[PDB]
Design a protein around this nucleic acid. Sequence first.
DNA 1: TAGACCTGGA
DNA 2: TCCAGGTCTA
Length: 273
Amino acid sequence: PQLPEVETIRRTLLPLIVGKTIEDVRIFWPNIIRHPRDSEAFAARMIGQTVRGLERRGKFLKFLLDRDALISHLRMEGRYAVASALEPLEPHTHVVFCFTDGSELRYRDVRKFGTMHVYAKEEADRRPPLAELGPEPLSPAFSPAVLAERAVKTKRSVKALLLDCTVVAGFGNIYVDESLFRAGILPGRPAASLSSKEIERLHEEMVATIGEAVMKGGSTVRTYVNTQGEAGTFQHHLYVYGRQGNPCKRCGTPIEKTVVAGRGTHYCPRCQR
DNA sequence: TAGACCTGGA
DNA sequence: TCCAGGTCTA
Ligand SMILES: [Zn+2]
């Protein structure tokens, strides 16, 4: 899940939990809880608080309670669902927040990579993991100027730059490869070798891609679905991600898949330079 | 940067 | 065995 997916999850989840009061918190896999470290302290402090809001920061879900904020990262497979406490639990459900109305927020995560941090509302943003987080791609905080200032200060791939949450927030493997394709830039090329026109083109593409992905409800390429188990529709507008060995939608040239920044990387050998 | 941190699907 | 919408590390 990246900005689009998390944003979609956030939108479909909020109305289902807003106003509900946490009566209990069950943890079936303690490692997911990062702060406080003690899974029992994490549970105990949630008890009694009401969900007042659900915000997003980068790829993080920020559950706003009474005095605390629950910072949740779905990582690769984290998923939330709201269901009746009387129904059996689905597999890989590691954390369940029981509400006083008998319903419950269930956190499923097959790979168990997700993380949860609870801090007093005020502390949340100045503490990790939200502390060291780049600006929102859909806000004036993210400008070609910002991307430029970071590109010139590094010799690493423009892909590694974009995948860096400190540079810009919310971009993952799918949207980085897609934005770079749409900007006509090879992902493996040095970030500092990007010209002012390219950087202003990339920025424009990134912002455009993220926005469209948000409208289409995110990209369902493997296991992603919004809170209602509904798949997104942006995967049908993907140019390169996961299309290796398939003709490029623009030029017909077979899409390539290599490894860049340690990640599977897709691109058109002809349309990107 | 090759692995962790985990687990299921091709 | 190879791979994965995330992210740190030796
Ligand atoms: Zn092409």
